[PDB]
Amino acid sequence: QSKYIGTGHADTTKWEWLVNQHRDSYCSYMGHFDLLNYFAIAENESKARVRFNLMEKMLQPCGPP
Amino acid sequence: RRHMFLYNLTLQRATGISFAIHGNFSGTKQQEIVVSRGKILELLRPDPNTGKVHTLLTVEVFGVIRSLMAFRLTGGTKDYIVVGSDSGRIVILEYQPSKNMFEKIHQETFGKSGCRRIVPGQFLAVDPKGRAVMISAIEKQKLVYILNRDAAARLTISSPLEAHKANTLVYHVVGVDVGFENPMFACLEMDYEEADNDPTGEAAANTQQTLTFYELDLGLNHVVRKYSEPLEEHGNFLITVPGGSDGPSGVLICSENYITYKNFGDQPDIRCPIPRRRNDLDDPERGMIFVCSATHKTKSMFFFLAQTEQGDIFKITLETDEDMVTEIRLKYFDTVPVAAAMCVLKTGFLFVASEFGNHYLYQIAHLGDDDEEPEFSSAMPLEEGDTFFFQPRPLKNLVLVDELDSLSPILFCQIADLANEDTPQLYVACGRGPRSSLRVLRHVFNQVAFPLQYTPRKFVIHPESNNLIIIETDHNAYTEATKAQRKQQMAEEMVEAAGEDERELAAEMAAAFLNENLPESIFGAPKAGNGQWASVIRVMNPIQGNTLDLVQLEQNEAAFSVAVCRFSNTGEDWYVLVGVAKDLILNPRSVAGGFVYTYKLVNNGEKLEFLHKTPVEEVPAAIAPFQGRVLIGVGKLLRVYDLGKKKLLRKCENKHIANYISGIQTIGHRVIVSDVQESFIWVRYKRNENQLIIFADDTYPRWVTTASLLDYDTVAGADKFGNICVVRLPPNTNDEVDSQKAEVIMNYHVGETVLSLQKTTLIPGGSESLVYTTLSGGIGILVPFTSHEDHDFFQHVEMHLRSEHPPLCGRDHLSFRSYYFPVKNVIDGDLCEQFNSMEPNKQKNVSEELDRTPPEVSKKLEDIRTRYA
Amino acid sequence: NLPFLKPDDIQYFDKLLVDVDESTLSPEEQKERKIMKLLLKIKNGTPPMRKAALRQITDKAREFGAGPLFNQILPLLMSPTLEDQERHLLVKVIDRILYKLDDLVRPYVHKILVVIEPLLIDEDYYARVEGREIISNLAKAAGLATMISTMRPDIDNMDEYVRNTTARAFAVVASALGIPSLLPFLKAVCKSKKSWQARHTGIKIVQQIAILMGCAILPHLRSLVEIIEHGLVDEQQKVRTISALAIAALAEAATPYGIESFDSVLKPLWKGIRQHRGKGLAAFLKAIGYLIPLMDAEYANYYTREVMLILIREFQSPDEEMKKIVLKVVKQCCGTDGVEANYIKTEILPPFFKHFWQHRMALDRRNYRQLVDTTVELANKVGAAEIISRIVDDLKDEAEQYRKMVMETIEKIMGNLGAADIDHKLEEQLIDGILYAFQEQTTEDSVMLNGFGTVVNALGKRVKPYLPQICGTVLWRLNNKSAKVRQQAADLISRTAVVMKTCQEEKLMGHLGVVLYEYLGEEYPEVLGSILGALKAIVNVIGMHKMTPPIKDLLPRLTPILKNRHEKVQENCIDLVGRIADRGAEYVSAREWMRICFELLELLKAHKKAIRRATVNTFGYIAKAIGPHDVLATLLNNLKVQERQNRVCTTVAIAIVAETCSPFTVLPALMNEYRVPELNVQNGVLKSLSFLFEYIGEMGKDYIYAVTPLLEDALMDRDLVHRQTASAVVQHMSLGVYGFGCEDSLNHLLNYVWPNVFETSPHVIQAVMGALEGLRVAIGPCRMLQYCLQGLFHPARKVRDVYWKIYNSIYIGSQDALIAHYPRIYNDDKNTYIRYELDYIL
Amino acid sequence: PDLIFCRKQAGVAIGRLCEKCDGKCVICDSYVRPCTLVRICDECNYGSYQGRCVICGGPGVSDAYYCKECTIQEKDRDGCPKIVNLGSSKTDL
């Protein structure tokens, strides 16, 4: 279970859990077409630009520890 | 009452496109196009004689298509279709023109289901000779299958080969035309291991994107990570350049403001800046990237078509000295709406699948070459600060031969009989930006389109005049006045700081610039700024396309709510309230305040007379009439307002709403508040004592989009994640007792995001139904069952088709409709009607198990559709 | 420590036995000792030892050098006592060290090859696979030029067999480095002016490249053909034969694409057909036979009409290999589009059936199979009757093998094409030949049985006039002394029952049934099973009312047969009892049914799966017949009194009763049995409930509320076995009612399952985790997340341990659905934690 | 004990089972509802182990199936289900 990214243990910090769920969310946005559509309609940007901004946010979606 | 058992049917299939590929799928010399509508795989055939697109096959795959590519074996005559899905499976399909179906040739399993982070499915890349395919996740895991044929010329797949690399994110993957060498796959990767272990944030900015090459050794049968070169600026996707005998192998990295060519070995990297638009009205700090690409190979030459954010399509050619490439050449081809995929067919036709709005098929008339238009190159010198420039112009190289109607994206819908016909009409506010539209749909459907100016958010109908009051709002956009002001300031800057004696030339050029108003419909709208907002209030006749009155708003005022109502203080004269946010930043969220415009609606439902403008703390997101007064949601506050001479006057408020009010609907003295995340909240208004007390909520979090009250205790709602729920209060719930929790009596995943639910009767003299609309352009209905016999029959039909006719892309149907919540009391009719698509033996067996005959089952399903209810 | 050493390992690892301080070691011998220890840990050792030793031998391979490693590896591989898996381990270590020593092995290439090449001709398929693997890795490391220089001398050696080994090695290196990497060398060697052995070996290389790489040579097919084409007109005869054979292998590999690549080969072959004789003619014909199915219809017609003269001439060839070649060539020609059926019927069929269909060909097994398959393929184009009528009269032959051959051919043809092409004369010929072939049998040919059944089932209702003549033979055969012959007749009845029923000859079938009834005492078990299957086939097509002997008489005779220990008898008897119980249950009293129950309950623990399958089905049938009450009560008593495996069978039988008769008939009595104070009775009830819900699945969507109080009590009964079994029950319930609206009752039971998550006993915590996962899939991951969040972060380290175990289970279960259920975590001073994108509102 | 699942990535090889374990599910040890066909990795079907029982490596007679419960919970999507004894060499037994 250690190999699957996102799993945790008793010493999992708040930051680790939340960056995990943020990257999960970004990948879920990339996967589900209508979620990305909603996002691109909200902030008036092309779908490719929204995907690029999400992939850019994958580095530190929450900030440094 | 009894639990409601529902039956789901799609009346209008989804019309948006996320992927499009072209090839010889029939095995003949004709070329077809396979498109992905989201949860639907479709096959289209453009007729080169009449220049019009026909649909040959449409299939519900009951999954999420995340990647789509076509390939062909060596010496083959027909192209296969590889589909990356939200199941842990890869599928390869062959189209059979005789049976008119997608035969599943191969289905191989590797991971778990869902749009997961480390499970392959998102990216698909095939070797140009068809010898292998690679399915990749966005993180870590990558898998390669080897494709071959056998004695009988049937496709064969191998076991997966592991190409994983921990802590590695993937931007894009594509195969490299290395001829018949060891197949190679190029990936745009980035390692975040350094950025996570540096609590100062330096490693974040220091980590850079890499171009990596994965080689598949066939003789050794394994994948190895050979070359990995860091890149200067971050690129969004890759293009395979033809290699082997007809072209030099390599890759084209598309980045922000640049396009680079790179190849392994002594090949020098050759970059070229992207030509910006001359007199670009956008923000100077805004970059420019490519949104999609296409490739067309001929025995003579080959070129690429790359479209920018502004919709400009450029033709790209590669000039090569022997083995190496000298320079990249780019010239302005044309301007079409922003597309998600482009296909350059043989026999001279281009197919443009727009990311939103209608789709287009053009005939290529002149490739170019015989043009005086400037061609740009990567060798032309240019200072570090400057770039190339070009001027947009009307279509020259393409001609519109067909236009395909697409309702995506639908942002609001009202089903009502505004015309004096008997059957109700569907009034759908959809489209995006300058390509938005209000469409009247009538009895699969017949559509009439009236163009709008910005993206519609919500519209209301005036009961007395039957006219429509629409609000259109878009982010980072300029208003009409601000657009004219920017044009004038640009023209003033143009004449000044120019050379004397040639300032005469600057003046005539700037006059021409001011005279030219380029159509935002085709050329896109000049949109810029982070917190800028363009909003417009419109009055429209539902019969004609005419606009009756129009109100532009401030450069930072964005409308989000609208309602028309009579007031008890002021007789029967109508009013129009419009909620507006000011200085709204989406990320991170920050708003200065909000306003509520009160208009009089003076003429016979034709003119808006500004009464006053009430300020308020946060954005007014919901406005609904309530017994001679209005209920307004501002932020997480729910207030009752009454009309005053100079303001809208607060009379009672509720503060304990969880997060933020996104919509409110009332029946009786009960108000149903939709929260952005914490689902529905039942609040009660006490006329005596004038207090708004929360008496019920829900036990699950729901990102509610829309809602519709079925009865006094029952509410139907929709998710951002494409779900529909029906939640009912306990029967003996007292509005006096606070701690009451609602029970969810229905759950169902549509697979597409719903933005309008309405309980109506589509055909007079029919039963009631729950009609939902789709952000991807679909229209569906949920029908209540009349008897338990029909319920058991259709439930057994669902079971037998789940077993004997599984979804096409490896998904499990019961798992799929249980995407976020397990299914509760819904039957999937879109699956049940696939009984007519099975083979004779399967149909006979299923009908015999149902103790019926196959025509009888088809008749029953068709009858449920004839009811439309 | 050191692994165990077999007798044979002593020779190779003796030095490891003596204990010597590794300070007083020569530098070379120091390395020899470590390589010995590493190889011994690899060859004999646990998978951890193997993995660690692989890492160590590959990481230090460059420091170790190639010489000593390959010296210790080759004798180990050449050991005659090497077991098959040890060879695979050695091949893997060879690959992983050859990847490291890229250029280091270039000196030793030759040596390695002379040890490895025999593996390429070993009889073991995996031995050849491993040899090819290591030669490929060698060629990848050593490089093209090193391998070419190493193997080039033996190309012209006089011994044909060393040339064959060299050509196979070259084909392997071609598959390892690619066809174009060796294309110039092959172009040079195929036209070598030095000797003819060099060009023969180059053409053999091309042939083996085809044989090895199959469809992968289609890209370079034109290149290979152009390099090899000149060999067809050479002065040497052996090189012409081998060039034709290589062309044949290339055509076999490129099927069905790439005819245009052989454009410069058609006329040389066409001329050589009329020129050459003997083995070279056979090679030319084989090449043409593998080349025709690649052509167009009209050109296939032309070329086949061109070659058919010599093809017909070579039918009467004395050479057996030539016969096999021309037979395969005929099969290939007549299986293509373009060769017309009337053309085959006119020109090919008379000589075919004159020279080929003789008793001699039936004696050789290879020719037997070849001719049978070829004639069936011919029938697939020229028509069934046009083939059958030419050999149907041979069914009355003195030689039994020839009758067997024609029977197999007719069987396969009529099974592929039916009997619509057969006229009355051929029908009577078929019947009169088949009856004589069946009556005249020395052994018990299964081919005769299969053919009889196939012909009868293909004729269908057309066999009515012959049915008395057939049943007379079947009756006379059931009296025959040979038991295998009796079971053959019984299996014929079993296969022909349906057609007999369609023929409206129900009195003949009644006579057959009443004749089989007296044979139910057959001591030989296989014959008993066959006659039971025959009785079942007769029952299943004729009514239960007109069945003779009547069912009331038949079933009690079946009752004691269930005690037989033969699995064929058990299966057929249980299946016949089930056919009786499904529809004929009214003719049998409930007491006999209870005795059948008692015998079936014992058979629920048979080792063969089919017996348990049949026992479950027929017990369900007899449970619908009997009614729930009596069998239910006696099963509950058996549950109390019995334990171990025989209790599990009563649990299965209770679940069967619950599935057949609604669980409302069984659940009250079981839950009442829970009321007894004794703990063992309670454990039995809990096991019954677990298997009952696991068995009935969706049927339990209405009985969760009913069993909820008992589960409430059992989940707090202190006895860990109770809570373990109750958690299993909740698990099976959740998995069974998934998606049927049982969220209320299951959510309620979750609150009683939850407190038991803090338990150290391994089995019961395993059961509780399984129940929690089932509840996750039935309720939804959102509720499980709601229950996990309160303790995901907690001062107690053990509470965190347990709750994170649960959360990992949930997260692995449904990572994508959780995106909608994570709580709002507000931004703090240093980091941005709120998912702003989801807060957008349109 | 010392027995663990292979858990490597499964390939095109179909899992196989001997007579004594004909209808059992490799994971949960249940006979109720065979659902999806078992797939083993490419190493566990090599050489002498081809077509061998997943639990014992003995001669197999029937295809191995995951049950319906395991399919619902996607336990068929985990690694190769062949059993390996970490305390036995390849030559032993």
Ligand SMILES: *C[C@@]1(O)C[C@@H](/C=C/C(C)=C/C[C@H]2CC[C@@H](NC(=O)/C=C\[C@H](C)OC(=O)NC)CC2)OC(C)(C)C1
């Ligand atoms: C791999 C294995 O676990 C196999 C076992 C053998 C177990 C046997 C022979 C058990 C008998 C036992 C099985 C369960 C019960 N009977 C039962 O469930 C019968 C039928 C069911 C409903 O249907 C099927 O079985 N369908 C296929 C009671 C009797 O041996 C070991 C060594 C433990 C290894």
Ligand SMILES: [Zn+2]
């Ligand atoms: Zn299982």
Ligand SMILES: [Zn+2]
């Ligand atoms: Zn394995």
Ligand SMILES: [Zn+2]
């Ligand atoms: Zn076994």
